[model samples]
Target: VGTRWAVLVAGSNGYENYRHQADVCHAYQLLIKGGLKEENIVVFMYDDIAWHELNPRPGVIINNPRGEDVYAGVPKDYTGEDVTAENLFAVILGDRSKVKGGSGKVINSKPEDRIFIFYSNHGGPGVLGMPNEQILYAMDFIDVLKKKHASGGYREMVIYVEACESGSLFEGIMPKDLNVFVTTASNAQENSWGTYCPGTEPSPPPEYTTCLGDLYSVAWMEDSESHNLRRETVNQQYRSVKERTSNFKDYAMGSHVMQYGDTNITAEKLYLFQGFDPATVNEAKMEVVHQRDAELLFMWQMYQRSNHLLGKKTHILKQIAETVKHRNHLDGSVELIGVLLYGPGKGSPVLQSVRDPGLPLVDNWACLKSMVRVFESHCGSLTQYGMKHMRAFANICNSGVSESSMEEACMVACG
Candidate 1:
């Protein structure tokens, strides 16, 4: 038996991205209450939501509708500009020399330690976003995990990732021999959903404009919160979360929950990694909204609530319209780039195609990043909506599109 270490990261910032940090904060509460010491827990959050100007509850952050404040004592080990992929890797690897900023609290775990990592953010096909716009490539993350494993500093590790297409991070690259098990919010080719938003059936308070949590994230966390950790196994929780996250009535409104790498280890007791705690259970399911549409929902809620205030209503309406316009522009520009690169009909097929199930998103990670930069330099930031086209970008690399040609296409399409 050894220490339990956790790295809880909320990789996005701003009030519109409230759910990410809320999810991280809630996980911290669970772990700490379940006997995890603060010294062994490293938190990386942008740390902006609790006291955000628009936060109606002032200093409190909740993960469910009318839920208790999860933000009360969350450790700010890494905040603001320090919440980067580099810092996260450094903390996990316990390399203080590599960490750039924040509290400087590294994992420093021992060979017998059990490490649990939970990351919540906006993600694309092969990359995860950080607060300052830094991207964490799946290839790089797996490499770091492999490095950590090789260091012989821990006995086992479990990672739970809550982001769009998060399964891609481990889909084809995770080493089963490394003793690292991972569960993701969604599979390699779909988008995750958000929960407890402004207009959902069991919505947050009327004053709130954003969602409280992600669907798959809330499913697992709530399950953990209500269960006796010592009595349940990680595999049991995975089964519960998978069933709850993907099935919601007769509608097709959810994403698949996936597990990868050493699935056999999931048979271990949940408390082995999460620690032990006694808790009660409750049952009630709420509606879920698409992760990409959460921001739009917030804007629309603001517009509706602005009611008698003409100026505010008009401004919000315009903002909503602009958001939609930008999404369309992103779609049109990517389609144009495809057409310019591969000609009319052939471009769409190539850009929209999915790799075989076992294939990774792209063979070369640098090529994918280069294509992203080239397109963004000419077109603009590939906001969450633009992330949908990451598959297209990867396909461009798969098809051997040169950087210069990609840049030229972007210039023509966006200009």
Candidate 2:
């Protein structure tokens, strides 16, 4: 029902001690050989991996094949800048100029045009980096995608960040309207582990553990081959991977995968293959509601201007007021405010009209008005107190208060 999918595979330091290179290689093979067309797959790596050797394209070749000690090589010129790791994956994944068919015709945008992004590299609190200084932070990646999504570029973006603290990067980047999904390697403080092949030489002490490739990647590829690419099945596979690797304590590894955004999307649907479940419709609907509520709450909190305590109170009042107003409008009645203020006193004529035959609708608008008046009086007193405090602060400043003393005062007052 949609456009063709685009895949971006980034594998850094394959030639280095890291063993995950084979895992990334296996994932690429499964993706293309399984169903995804060769044209849709974009591979980015730091070394001369099998993908580069077999499918040569315009990409960077770090520390060339000859093993010469050359640190850098001629950088490939792309879109507007030289091919850099920070943007290379993004550019190729989003390039619309590349034609698909033999006629060199531009591919039409379709609803099925999902995106699959995979990263296998060394990561820290907020960054994913290669052996060199080539680094992309969580904020940088999210900002790039936010700009691209705003420009109506890619749809249904699914990202898998396999590194330490990769999960923390997804907090505020995902948008509810877009079918964006993210799976992080571990919690921000935890590290993802890689495994060394049987014949591989061991790296240095601490680096040895980190060099082991991603367990999730292996499980993901192997599971997809055995079972269909259903989301639930993939989740189960990840659980199995966690259980299987429980014995290894060298690396701080856990099942740290968390999914956000489109819950109904499956690997088959993403690749535009087949095999969909009927229950996906209901699941998608529930997920839509959950996402909408989360987004609305975020927007409300961001726009709220009062201090923490007061802000909470004001938010509740605003919500209640808005809900009542909306319900009244839908019932074809006049806008009502402060309906909750009605006590056991004489109800207003408007309230009486809406009252049930035997039930009384208490109106407390008068009490609410009094409460507002009291609040206004308290605010006036607070304003006077603030003026007095400012006068005292000015006197202290004129008397040459020590910088530390002033800072202490600010910490007490402002904080």
Candidate 3:
């Protein structure tokens, strides 16, 4: 079956984003139990959760309501300031010279190896989050994948992305002949969800203020842990994960799990990438939370817990208020930018419009990157919730709004 190598990345940092790192840790445990060697697996996380003051159980992390600790043996490969798009791309391409920090572990695979990459985080329309508060542009990531293919370092590759608007990374530009298969938690226009949260069924213990794992991520990992991976095909697992991800208690909360790239690769056994394990491992319909709102949930839980502590209550109350205010500001700023660029009646529709089916978000990737930078420099970091406005940015770009004009609009709206 050739060598099996896996790269698991949890791209977000901070306590409220605990579910992302927990998700990657669970995947690590599953791969190890499934016969994959530790050296063959690479992990990238901020490495902040386990020991954080917010974590009730120091040095331990779990993904289910009452599940095993998934954090114990997780490898700290790229961590803290080292977890950037530059490092991720270098790791994927096996270019040791380009890697900046952490354990310096790259895939280093041969031509016959099989590779699996799973990334969990919050995503915007054409960007993925990185721990250093940096972002990975979709076109840049695709370029790296293409470079890897050209280098002929592996036989097949599979990627599973757990994030909002993850499908946007591959929707129109991914080449079908790359011999890589990709599955994303949501299509280009929607948000992914968080599971095993404080207020939901199958909830974590009363002490956890944050979510334990992401919805689509948990569905795939638990599915792998429960069955004979050698007997299952990637396509089968995708179908199962998609069904579970789509059939949520709150139907409107569900996302469309999507597959792109060389889908034919999914016909192979799941064990080719994750290895095989003979461990046998749920259908309680629990409400799930949107990935973007997870932080607010954590804050709300903290406020509830601090009811009797006057100082803590005031602190939490201020945090909640600022969060709401920031959200409103983001919404207002984006709408105003559209209005400034296209005039009143025309601007709102331009801001709200999405591409027709089969159309890419924008023709120029550089413009998208510059626009994000311009807005952030003026309006502040798009910071999770503000990412919802990425479509607005892309739409403006598509409408031929020049970069200088967008910059001017940002200056006017934000100031």
Candidate 4:
């Protein structure tokens, strides 16, 4: 009722040596137990057990060559009066004129109203087979659905072909909005498992067939009932069955689960009644050291406006002198006020000219006497290489400030 309908095709025991009708019936029970209303569910099954004939409905309930209804357990009376399988098939096949019973109530010619279609039977590539060699190929099936979708506003479609080369049906007519999930029981070169007795007893045991339907359907039904079945979960269950079987190595049987239509409808969301422990989403954690370092770097950039030392000369000089004085005070060394005062001709061409002070001693003297020393030391190699001890000193006479002492302070700060 929330959204989506459930259609089941259980083609058990008809055409070939392989047939597992009971398995399909069991899968139907699983779906029913999972939450699907009886009225909302439609099934197409060969009445091998004669249930359909005894309960005769207004649909095609075929009897085998033995003249026995293939399915013996299906109810005969449409007391609840929902749509029957024949009408449902007609709708899917795009021939709704013959639709009978309450089935007409659910039929809609819209792409969005269509529900998922599930088929569990003998299949090979494009064709679906009955107990006889007669086949309903994948193209025929898809063509039917395509027409149905064209007429009935359905947004998505899915096909689960559990036969040999079942993967062959996916070649064309797959819509972008529809997602196809496939599981080929065996490769094209190999044949899927045939119907075998599940036990030595006359009663059909659940393990009789190599068909993935038993495993897939069981898992699917379990998940659907528990509200946990998803495409991925179904696949995992298939693998688990393969692992547990004795013929694990030789089991050519597998599944090709194809999903069609919108991917937004996840298997989990589709089978919401099946309780699922939602997987946790992992998030990467940042390294502690890197985090702190990045924070410090950002803080430093935020406070320090300029990258060039000369552009921030006054601030740099004050900071450097304070650091040196503090370190010296901590180490019991001499504390001194470091200051480098330039002449009035600060921006003069002569002062700016580096080569003008040609000799090493002159260059050292000019550098030693400049107020730019504090900012420049950190920028160039001055602080690192001992430019402090190499710069020339001058003992200017009659200067208000003692030039000798001032030069010593500058040298110590640079060092």
Candidate 5:
């Protein structure tokens, strides 16, 4: 007899990562169209795609091949810089007086409410991104959830996170009894993939060149569209998503979609979380080219998007170089730090790959979390692509690598 509320967030902005923003918007429409009251749902997105200069269809965003415009009805509650971890907590805690912009809506739970949060972004071992390149650390998120529970507000919560290494946020940290359930796009050390890429579907009007939705996000959403949400259990959706995400063959898939915390709660009806009604529906949907690297996929999209022309080169070419440079810097810093941390005499001793790097890394989450910050403080931001190498950082920490060594590594690797 309780009401359903959702805090849907899309944390990045640039048009290159169109799928991230599209995924959240589609979540909004799914809830709205399926009968969630508009006011009960709070949406936080950079909300820049529709009018982005390169958008093929102005003010219109689609999630799948021929998926309707989710961008149209969305209420941009927290757009641009307004979407921040600081602000996010305020919203969850219903602290309106401290909020800075847009609607200032917060989760006003009454102990009977089930909080639903769907956040999509670029992430690494223990962090999630915001549009402005800052981050929301995993510990801070846990703290927020704890505070929410202590506040005597929510009875339970469900979060679906789509990001590289997303499982890092919950894998070994969340307490099951806290009444929270999480499903991540990938495990702690892997990358969550992209879908509907280069050759998969016709560019809506023939001018598009990027993916329409992310692999994990699209799978669950499309499955939701086909099934009767009220009768379907959360566990059913998780299995369907896992199957689709792992459909890649001829090799191991790039990621392992995972679930964490409060397994029993997954037995709850999908409608309880999705706010979508039950309807046994069936239809043909877009087919995705599974297991594609998001950054590489974007590189290809940028090239294809260049209209196959050459003005010597254009924005896409510049972007292509930028992408490579970022990836280089990302890996380069890890190597430089390794050399320093292991010391000149040690000279880069080989490191073993743990089956679950993210979980093992958490054995020292506090130490490593602080250590990574030391680097970020001086070297540069890890949000882009650099953070993916966090396993290296954690390895250094596990060995009790000196703080200065971490700093020296950061200095050399960052440039």
Candidate 6:
């Protein structure tokens, strides 16, 4: 092989969703430890959590339940508003001219290079969210990869995506012949689960106030940390992640993990791109159960820790109540989006009754773009209140809904 390259992205922000940024930092450390060159590695994240007032340990972040800080030495390539879908693909394609803003450091790989990409974020049926609230649709991403391949600057590429419905990013989408392989935290229809939650885990520490990791992400990174990358294969990590991700106590709550594209790529050793460390490392012993809601678990822990003191009780009660209400608001807004678009009929049945079948996203790029622009023009930012409507957007796109109808529905429904 040739020089190895890695693109790591953490596409969400805020204190409550700390797992994403922490995961990025840990992944960066893994690549560094594995010996991948620093200049060849590119990272994108919101870069907001580590210094936030809510973080128990300022300037330090962790991924495992009680793991050490992974925040130090993290290099920020594209951060804040600079981390966008446009910049992500530009970096991948090594086209600095197209990038709007950043360090201008892209994957300068040769044809023999092995490329690795790891993404942790919030994803819907066909798109992933950036910290700036912009979205990257699957088709657009696939298009860029195609351009990269056509340019003939890479040999094999592997991608690991940790997001809800992340399999949608590659299912029925990525060409098996592109010499590409992908693994996702969840299949097309499920919400990928979070782990290392303080309340659900036994005898949680007071400092462990939130979920420190995503289930699938934690599984892969910990396994990499404990293994010999020179011998371990991507296939090994995939199998390990699949088994653990499926082991959730609540079967319905567990994400159906998936692997896609060329199975042949699985044979590549972890060190092929991630590099190798000869140092002896301890094995990770992770629980395969405890599939619980992070928010509810945190609320319970807060309530228990407070011992129901009146002043604290009043505060907790109001906050917890608001938290639960916001969660419901997200669920309800999607229904409202559908209620106006299809009018409870005329392709609207797919919205109310029909659900996403267990297959990868096969949306058309043009249709999806048109839908986003028209809806956003009428409603508002999808990253804000309109996020729940992403499922609805997928449905309308699949149903062959036109942009005219979408804009009109936005007027009636969103208004």
Best by lDDT: 3
What C-alpha lDDT do the candidate models reach, one value each? 0.88, 0.40, 0.89, 0.37, 0.75, 0.76
Give Cα distance to truth, residue 140, candidate 2, Å.
1.7
| lDDT (10s digit) by residue, model 3, range 1-415 | 4798999999899999999999999999999988889988989999999999989999999998876899998888998999889999999999889999789889999999999999999888878888776878888989999999999999999999998988888878888888899999998988899989998887799889999999899999989888888788999999989888886535586888999989888889899988888665317575789898899999999999999999999999998999899999888888889889999999999988878655777788888878889999999988767767778888878888899898899999887
Model 1 Cα lDDT, one tens digit per residue, 1-415: 7999999998798888899999999999999889999999999999999999989999999998867999998888999989988999899899999999799999898999999999987988887878887778899999988898889999989999988888887777888988899999888888888888887777788888999999888888888888888878999999898888876532367778888888888989999999877554324566888878888888888888889999999999999899999999899999999999999999899998988766799888889989999999999998766777888999999998899899899999987
Top-down TM-score ranking: 3, 1, 5, 6, 2, 4
The lDDT of model 1 is: 0.88
**For residues 29-127, could you state the per-residue lDDT of candidate 4 as single tens digits?**
555544555554555544443233322322322211122222334432111222233454564554546666533433343444435555555543333
Worst 10 residues of 1 by lDDT: 277-286
The numbered model that scores best in TM-score is: 3
Off by over 4 Å in 5: 201-205, 248-254, 278-296, 302-309, 312-315, 343-352, 355-360, 363-366, 412-415
Ranking by lDDT: 3, 1, 6, 5, 2, 4
Question: Model 4, residue 10: displacement in angstroms?
Answer: 2.8
TM-score of 3: 0.97
Which of the two, 3 or 4, has more TM-score? 3
Please write out the lDDT profile of model 5 over residues 360-387, one tens digit for every residue.
3456667777776887776666765665
The C-alpha stretches of model 3 lying farther than 4 A from their native spots are 248-250, 279-282
TM-score of candidate 1 relative to the true fold = 0.96
Clashing residue pair totals per candidate (backbone < 3 A)? 0, 14, 1, 59, 1, 0
Tens-digit lDDT track of model 6 for 1-415: 4988999998778776688888899999988888888799999988888998878889999887566899999888898888898899999999889887788989878999999999987777777878887887888888888999999989999999988777777777788888888899987767776777664552234676667888888888878888988788988988878877776434564667788888898998888967787694532334332222455566666677777587886787788888677656545545566776655554346663334454544456677677777766765555632443565676778777777777777676657
Which residue pairs in candidate 1 have backbone atoms (N, alpha carbon, C) closer than 3 angstroms, thus clashing? none
Report RMSD (Å) for each prediction in the order shown: 1.7, 22.2, 1.5, 35.8, 3.0, 3.4
In angstroms, give how far residue 327 of model 6 lies from its true place: 5.3
Q: Model 6: residues >4 Å from true position, as ranges?
A: 202-204, 248-250, 281-330, 340-349, 352-362, 384-388
